[PDB]
Amino acid sequence: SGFRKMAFPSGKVEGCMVQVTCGTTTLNGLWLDDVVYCPRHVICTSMLNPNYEDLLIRKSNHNFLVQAGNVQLRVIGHSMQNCVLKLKVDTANPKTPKYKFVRIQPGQTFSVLACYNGSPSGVYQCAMRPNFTIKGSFLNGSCGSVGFNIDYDCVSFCYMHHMELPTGVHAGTDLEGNFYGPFVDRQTAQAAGTDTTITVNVLAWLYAAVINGDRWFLNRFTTTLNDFNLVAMKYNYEPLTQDHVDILGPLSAQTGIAVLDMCASLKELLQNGMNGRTILGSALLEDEFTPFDVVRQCSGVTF
Amino acid sequence: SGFRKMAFPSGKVEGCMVQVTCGTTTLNGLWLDDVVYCPRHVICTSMLNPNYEDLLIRKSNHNFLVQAGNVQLRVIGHSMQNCVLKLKVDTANPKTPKYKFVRIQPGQTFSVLACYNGSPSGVYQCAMRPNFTIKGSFLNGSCGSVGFNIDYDCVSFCYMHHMELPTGVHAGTDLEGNFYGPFVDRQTAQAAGTDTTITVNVLAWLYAAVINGDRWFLNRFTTTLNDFNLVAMKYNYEPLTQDHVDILGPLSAQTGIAVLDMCASLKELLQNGMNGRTILGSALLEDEFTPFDVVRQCSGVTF
Ligand SMILES: *[C@](O)(C(=O)NCc1ccccc1)[C@H](C[C@@H]1CCNC1=O)NC(=O)[C@H](CC1CC1)n1cccc(NC(=O)OC(C)(C)C)c1=O
Ligand SMILES: *[C@](O)(C(=O)NCc1ccccc1)[C@H](C[C@@H]1CCNC1=O)NC(=O)[C@H](CC1CC1)n1cccc(NC(=O)OC(C)(C)C)c1=O
DSSP states (O other), rough: OOOOBBBBBOEEEETEEEEEEETEEEEEEEEETTTEEEGGGGOOOOSSSSSHHHHHHTTOOHHHHOSSSSEEOOEEEEEEEEEEEEEESSSOOTTTEEEEOOOOOTOOOOEEEETTTTTTEEEEEEEOOHHHHHOOOOTTTOOEEEEEEEEEEEEEEEEEEEEOOTTTTTEETTSSSSSSSOOOOOSSSOOOOOOBBOOHHHHHHHHHHHTTTOTTTTOOOOOOHHHHHHHHHTTTTTOHHHHHHTHHHHHHHHHOHHHHHHHHHHHHHHHHHHOOBTTTTTTTTOSOHHHHHHHHHHHHHOO | OOOOOOOOHHHHHHEEEEEEEEEEEEEEEEEETTTEEEGGGGGGOOSOOHHHHHHHHHHOOGGEEEESSSSSSOOOEEEETTTTTEEEEOOOTTTTTTTEEEOTTOOOOEEEEEEETTEEEEEEEEOOOTTTTTTOOOOOOTOOEEEEEEEEEEEEEOOOOOOOOOOOOHHHHHHHBBBBOOSSSSSSSOOOOOOOOHHHHHHHHHHHHTTOOOOOOOSSSOOOOOHHHHHHHHBBBBOOOHHHHHHHHHHHHTTTTOOOHHHHHHHHHHOOOTTTTTTTBBBSSSSSOOOOHHHHHHHHHHO
């Protein structure tokens, strides 16, 4: 038993991490087969309004210093993939895992391997927020650090780090170089929109608390999907859908507590607070665990 | 910027993890050079009051099934090291990192690589509590999962998992097989003692909040080490020492806030609560970040 914010084991990703330098700019790259992926802004030098097309036409293969430990990698081709650069190199990464590029949805979680100069510093879990930001831990040099999920032996890469927004939250792309959210890889006035609480996740985490013997917030009441959503909206909670109710099925079954019964507990925590009590060691309602995360950790699925 | 519960990259440990079976009992082992370490209780079968000396005398090398992926490992020697078993095997782990066995102190943090059947499931950070338990996430089969720190390229192994106590907290040994706390690898009446809050860690985390621009709890007041400890004791907080004050030095310098000034903020949070506000996204005072953890993550030290 017990319930922790758990990241995927990072080894498979650590073996893909390289350093990419243009001029005085160093950041991280991801080396899979004979390609290195990094943020295209590695090629910026002065950048309120740069033209990346121009900047990339003016680069040559030999301008890109790529380092895998010591072993320098020779770049033999380059191309822009939206906001990512694909650096074709002369050698296929022998440590390349089974992998795929997947875009995630707001509410889904992934592990981040925070890297500096191609070197892994640490691993943590976060969620894609409803406003397409992530609440990460990123300093100067973390650009190109990636977010990922693991299923069996297969790494699903879902995020590459690009920037910090004024509120201290983070924005990036999928590995096809397409931004999550209305953000651009330029210095502009851009700010995170208003964020909401991921309702289905809070419900998953209340199920986790029950599976772990934290039961104090449970009540005999049930509510309707509509009367619940009436209260949720009031507190800046995402609407809950029949699809969400269906996804919470396995946890409903494991605990024998109907989803709409748990929604009655959530409505009451939203109206009355926790009255100086905690749930799974937290004094606030946690929303960065998906239904899958709770099943994975309360069942002991390995990779 | 940002501040997250960050684990060490786990790759170096993932390559050491093996499966160990005696009879119907399977758990995890740690394979370094030509030795596999696991909990000695792998040899129990019926165990209110077993004699392990007897149990081990009656085992043979061929009774121990050791599996590194598929590749079965041939056991050519065995011996008991306190509550750990050392299984001498015919082949040195080619993935053996630079490593050492270090015992940690209550208040210190480490990463856990939770494993099932020799396979890594996930990685999270926790602290050795003042009562020598850890608040982990462990199910049937997690025994032999290890706790570790990384410095440069060197893995300091500090914990091996053995059991869950009645309150849903976890107990284990160092890698020399010596228990943390007054616990034994038998079924008995044993329970965690009363736990305390790790004061020096709460202060480190308030420094982290300041470095991240969370400043609302700061005040113009200072307090004495003695008048602080008078309030702390009242709230089940560990006493703070001049050594603790000296360890918080670098964070004092970085923020220009004297330790005893921060203690005035902590005294006020203890007497008045947070008044429905949060610090680094928490509604309670966090005590599982060491001064080192805050410097490591607010400076971007890699491994
Ligand atoms: C990324 O470029 C990076 O890590 N680059 C390598 C590097 C940078 C600086 C010094 C040495 C090496 C960073 C990652 C950032 C740094 C701070 N935290 C992060 O997550 N990304 C940027 O600096 C990013 C590049 C833009 C997308 C093309 N960028 C540029 C300019 C401004 C900001 N942010 C900003 O102004 O935020 C506030 C909070 C307002 C200070 C930015 O992220
Ligand atoms: C460990 O032995 C293990 O993982 N063994 C392999 C295995 C066990 C069961 C089924 C298949 C394979 C476990 C780890 C435990 C399991 C649950 N959470 C954990 O952290 N350790 C034990 O089971 C431990 C062995 C004792 C030290 C020699 N043990 C034995 C008996 C009782 C308990 N705990 C217990 O009763 O806790 C409560 C909360 C009271 C149920 C125990 O941990």
